[PDB]
Amino acid sequence: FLRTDDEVVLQCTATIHKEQQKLCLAAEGNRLCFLESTSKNVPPDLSICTFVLEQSLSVRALQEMLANTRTLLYGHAILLRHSYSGMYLCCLSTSLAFDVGLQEDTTGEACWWTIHPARSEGEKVQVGDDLILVSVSSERYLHLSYGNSSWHVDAAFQQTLWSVAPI
Numbered sequence: 001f002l003r004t005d006d007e008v009v010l011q012c013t014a015t016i017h018k019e020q021q022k023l024c025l026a027a028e029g030n031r032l033c034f035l036e037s038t039s040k041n042v043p044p045d046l047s048i049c050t051f052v053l054e055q056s057l058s059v060r061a062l063q064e065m066l067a068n069t070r071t072l073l074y075g076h077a078i079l080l081r082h083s084y085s086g087m088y089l090c091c092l093s094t095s096l097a098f099d100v101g102l103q104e105d106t107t108g109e110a111c112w113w114t115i116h117p118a119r120s121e122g123e124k125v126q127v128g129d130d131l132i133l134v135s136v137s138s139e140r141y142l143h144l145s146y147g148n149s150s151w152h153v154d155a156a157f158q159q160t161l162w163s164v165a166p167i
Contacts, residue, residue, distance in 0.1 A: 001071045001072075001124060001125070001126065001127070002053060002071070002072045002125045002126075002127060002164055002166075003053070003070055003071055003072065004053050004054060004055060004056050004070050004072075005052060005053065005054070006052065006053050006166060007050060007051075007052055007083070007166065007167060008050075008051055008052070008053060008164045008165060008166055008167060009024050009025070009043075009046075009049045009050065009051070009164075009165055009167055010024065010025040010049075010051060010080075010162050010163070010164055011023065011024050011025075011038075011041075011162065011163040011164075011165060012025075012035075012144045012160055012161060012162050012163070013161070014144060014146075014151050016146060021037050021038075021039070022037075022038050022039070022041045023035040023036065023037060023038070023144070023151055024036050024038055024043050024049040025049060025051070025089075025153060025162075026043070026045065026048045026049045027048060027082055027084075027085060027087075027089075027101070027102050028048060028084075028085065030101070031087075031101040031102045031103075032092075032099055032100070032101045033089070033100045033101055033102070033153050034152070034153065035144075035150075035151045035152065035153055036048075036049060046167075047083070047084050048082075048084050050082070050083040050084065050167075051080045051081060051082055051083065051089065052080075052081045052083060053072065053078055053079070053080065053081075053164070054079045054080070054081045054088075054106075055078065055079035055106075056070060056072050056073070056076050056077070056078045056079075057076060057077055058075070058076055058077070059075070059076075059077055059114065059136075062077050062112060062136070066108075066109065069107075071124045071125065072115060072124070072125040073115075073121075073122050073123065073124055073125065074115055074116060074117050074119070074120045074121050074122065074123050074124075074125060075114065075115070075116070075121045075122065076114065076115055077112045077113060077114045077115075077136055078112070078113055078114075078115060079106055079111060079112060080111075080113065082102055085102055087102035087103060087104055088102060088103050088104075088105075088106055088111040089101075089102065089111065089113070090102065090103040090110045090111040091110050091111075091113075091135035091137055091138050091140065091155045092110075092155075096156065096157060097140070097143065097145065097154035097155055097156035097157075098135075098138055098140060098154060098155040098156075099154060099155075100142065100153050100154055100155055108137070109135075109136040109137035110135070110136075110137040110138075112135075112136040112137070113133045113134060113135060113136065113142065114133070114134045114136060115131050115132070115133060116131070116132040116133075116134060117129065117131075117132065118130040118131070118132060118161050127164070127165065127166065129163075130161035130162065130163060131161070131162045131163070131164055132159050132160070132161065132162070133162060135155050138155055140155035140156055140157065141155065141156055141157070141158060141159045141160060142155060142160060142162065143155060143156035143158055143159065143160045144160040
């Protein structure tokens with residue numbers, strides 16, 4: 001059971017030309033997130049792959065919150081805090097995929113992500129679960145994308161399975 005205040009790394013799996021690896025979400029100017037390779041999988045700079053599940057609310061509780069100014073459950077919207085920088089994973093408005101970066105304030109929709117299963121709803125989230133993350137602001141998926149020579153993270157129209165492992 002993932003719970004708030006937990007320390008975690010957001011991982012995804014990437015395969016190209018029959019070559020599989022495990023990537024971790026990371027960040028540090030442009031404020032943009034990027035991806036690190038691992039391998040007992042661990043990355044080169046763990047201290048920047050570390051996020052804390054600071055909050056978890058229902059969309060109603062969140063919508064109620066915006067209008068007026070613990071086990072995670074599928075369908076709930078969470079808040080991901082980057083330890084190293086103290087800022088929050090968010091979906092940007094700048095480029096069919098938006099960039100993903102870090103914002104200062106937890107205010108607004110941009111820094112909120114609803115969790116969906118790779119079941120289910122209201123049902124609790126398990127560590128072994130592969131999670132799909134959807135931006136409350138843009139309704140795009142936290143997505144693994146491949147550039148010319150490297151892997152990138154963005155908010156796109158297609159999904160990507162993430163693993164929120166304790167650490």
